[PDB]
Structures are given as structure tokens and as C-alpha cells.
């Protein structure tokens, strides 16, 4: 089966780290990416905490508890089935923002708890300290005096906004310490390094309320991930050459190389100019690693 | 291109009316019920309808600038990317919730980067999907004043549907089509109603458990990833219906036959689909007659 990428304009696809439309792409000015969401091989093998649907991105599910003076969530997969530590660093879709304050909105999700009343709440979750242990199945919730009614209840949580940990800057490249002090989490997607030849890793961006740095970078659009999982196309070269084309004339606006590990590069800054955000990526061919952009 | 449907298990795909994994299939209690959802609407050859978007990231969201007119609060709507809603193509901005005659409980955040340097950008608000003040087709919806909106007046926000309650005096009817508003001679832009096939067939609805309180099961007529699949493929529609098998992902046994029609929905002949495992994979078998017997 021939390899391909989605025919969809970039600005109609979602970020893979937050559920937001992509509003740009850029190379970094500096920081090694080791995102756990948006990770997949070109032949469709999911990595880290990455799953298929954008509906899963940056969400959690589980049962709220109160134990030894502290509140928390016992995690499950987003469909309510159990999280098995062997399969991944955390349940699929779990936010991959580390060393920061995750401001979550949540709702009760048991149908029997959704007959009457207001099922909703909000809570802060630190992606740091030993009590942040999603690989072990648990995370601490900061007590906001409004959690008691939810103790024992199953909820789904979504990432509403993010702030820095007090005393620290907000680092969107930090890897969460999923396994606490017990172990390095199983099946972490690896860090990515650029290959040479002037190439730089491309990040797809979304404006999002990561307060103090409201531009979330990811290494693949979510719909690329589902595309590769769907296709399972064998990888047949060092790199997949893509052209980013005008959506109407199909004229090439810029070349990119996608590597088997599931990320792409460019040689930036080829006369000042700005690429539009409504272009379409098109697979041209497998090329050697020596292909010069 | 040859036609196909996603090679993804059903329970890994999203509902098209809320961003939630599909956890079931059902037929309607009244098999003559006419759905006219505005999200999850697309033809088999990839033409979007209603407020349907490509990405699940857009489902049941809104964007716009909050206003206060003499104590009447509201949002002047835009598309989710911040560009203007021109109403050329859709009855509301793309992704807009299609739950009608009910109380939408939204969570929102300021979305201008200059408003995202420090502080808490978040809030919540109730929006009624009823009354003339709910006029998203005309670019405006009323916000219920919760005494916490003033700091956001003049600010651009993105809103998402957190949960839904019934309108006082009414049941929470998930088949209701919102009254999006009319604008003189301009077309409604509504995705059309789907009339039940009859003769033993029944429309298949993909369901998700969701906090539509008092009715916590949201039905839709296509998984969201079917929509992006068809938009991507643009496969010419070569028959009046597409025969699908729903197959066990392991054993690869056919668990049931379905028909997909060009308008972008699926039917079955209940014996019903609700009893099927939810981890199966739909597979395109062949183009068949619209009269093909399941």
C-alpha cells in the first residue's frame, strides 16, 4: 500500500497536544521535543500516550478519591476500561504538559449520576511531585473545597487551561514524570533530534491558554496520526518528501522531509516571506536522507 | 479514488455531535423519527453540510467577542479560527452545537494571546438554544447573566460545551433542531432531514455517554472520523448505496451488514445493532442498489 498524508488543509487539522485547530508551523528558536501525544511511526504504530481521535487529547478519566487527607483520581482509559501500566506512560490522551499546573474542568460520567442536577466541577492537578503518579494509576488533586460531593464518583476531565508551577517558568517541552519516584514510565516515546543537512524540526502550533506562553507546539497534526494508523503503509525509504502546496493551484510552496519516527523537518528561511496556513501537504516520494532541502 | 470507510474500530472514533468516544449503536425508539443533525453531516463523496467540520477538535464549540448591551449579555460570533462568520455556507459557525431548545452549559477561555500572559483566563456561562435572542445564523447569541461576565466584556473567547440541561418546562430532546435564525431571503444552509427508509430498515445512530442531564446518551448519524475520511478521499459515489460489513477486529468474522446511503448515514435491519460489540471495524464491501436487501 502506497504511503500518503492527509489531503486536508493544515488549518483544518487539530494540534495533537491540545484539541485546537492548527494556526501555524514554525521551527524552534532554541529544547528537545519528547512529546507523548501526537507520536506515531509513518507505518502507523502509535507511541507514548497517543491515540486515534482528537476527542481524546489532553483528557483524563477516573474515580475521585479522598485518602490520608488528600484528594486524587484513580485513572482509567477514557472509555472507562482499565489503564494497564504495561501499555503506556499513562492512559491514552493524558496531557503531556510537565512541571506545571493543569486547570481541569470535569463532569460525572456514570449515567446514573446524570439524571438530575449539575454534574460539573473544576480542579487543579500538578504535573509534578511524587503524588503525580499517573503511570502508577493515580494523581493528586489540589483541594478547592468543592470536591467532597464527587468522592467515589467517576468523572471525565478536560484540560481547560495551564499555568506555571510557582517558582518556575512554563516549559512546554518538559516531559511529565509519569512514574513518580518509582520507575521510568513504560513505553515513553523517544526524544527527537534533527538529522543534519541544515534541517530543523517543524512544530505545528495552536493558540491555547497555556498562560505565559499561549502557543502550543506539537510534532504532528492529530489527523496525520489517525491517517497513518488507518493506512499502515510500509515505510520504503529514509524519508518521505512532502510538498506543502497552494490548496487551489497545487503549486509547491515549500518542501518538507518526514522521518519514519513520525516528525518532519525543513530548512527554514530560504527576501523575507511567510507561508500561508491553509496549504495542503502532499506526499511526493520516498527519498534518501541526503535529499537536500 | 475507490470508496472506503475508516479502518478504525468504532470505539476509537468520536461522536460527531460531542467530542466523546462512541460507546454504542442504537436505533430510535420510534423508527420513523427524522434526524436533522447539523454536525456529522457529509456526503459519501466528501461534501460537508450544516455546521460540520473536518476535525473533532471543533465539535460543539463557539468563538466570539462578549458584549453587554444595557445589561443584555451576548457573544458576537466568529468562526473557531477567529475569522468572520459570513453565513455563506452554514446555519451557524462551523462546529456550533446542534442541541436545540435546551440550556447549554459552556466553559470558556480568553483566546487573544495578549490576554494570556498572566492570570486566570477562564469562565463559564449558560446559553439558551431557544428564543429570538439565540440567533447564531445572524451572528449573535444571548448569554445568561451569571454575575461573572463583566471582566470579559469586549474580550474574545472560545467556548466549549461542558454539559446540557433541559429547558424549564421541557424534556431534553436530543432530536430537536435548533432555531438558528433566519435572515430575510438568505438560505437557511441547514443540512437536510434524513427520512427513515422503512421496509424493515432503520437508521443507525452512534451513541456516546455524555452529561446531557436527564438523557445522558448523545446520538449522531456518523462517527466524526468517517467525515474527515470522506472529505479526504473525495471518492466518487458509484452506486445508490454502499454495503458495509461490521467485522470482529480479531477473528475478522462479519458481525452484521449495514447500508450507507449517499447522504451520509447508515441503516440496518434490526433483528438490533445495540447488542453488537462496540470494537468492530466497518469495511466497505461493494456498491449496491438502493433497494439491496439486508
Author numbering:
A (entry chain A): 230 to 259, 262 to 501, 504 to 526
B (entry chain B): 230 to 500, 504 to 526
Paper passage:
NoV VP1 has two principle domains, the shell (S) and the protruding (P) domains, linked by a short, flexible hinge. The S domain builds the interior shell that forms the basic structure of the icosahedral capsid, while the P domain dimerizes constituting the arch-like protrusions extending from the shell.
As expected, the P protein is dimerized via a non-crystallographic 2-fold axis, forming an arch-like P dimer in dimension of 54 Å × 62 Å × 67 Å. The P1 subdomain, constituted by the N′ (K230–A279) and C′ (A420–L526) terminal regions, forms mainly the legs of the arch-like P dimer (see below), while the P2 subdomain, formed by a large insertion from R280 to L419, builds the majority of the head of the P dimer. The P1 subdomain is a mixed α/β structure containing an amphiphile α helix and two twisted antiparallel β sheets: β1-β9-β10 and β9-β11-β12-β13-β14, where β9 strand was shared between the two β sheets. The P2 subdomain is constituted mainly by a β-barrel structure formed by two twisted antiparallel β sheets: β5-β4-β8 and β8-β2-β3-β7-β6. The major structural differences among the four P domains reside on 6 loop regions, including the previously identified A-, B-, P-, T- and U-loops in the P2 subdomain and the S-loop in the P1 subdomain, consistent with the variations, insertions and/or deletions of the sequences of the loops. The five loops (A-, B-, P- S- and T-loops) occupy the majority of the top surface of the BV P dimer.
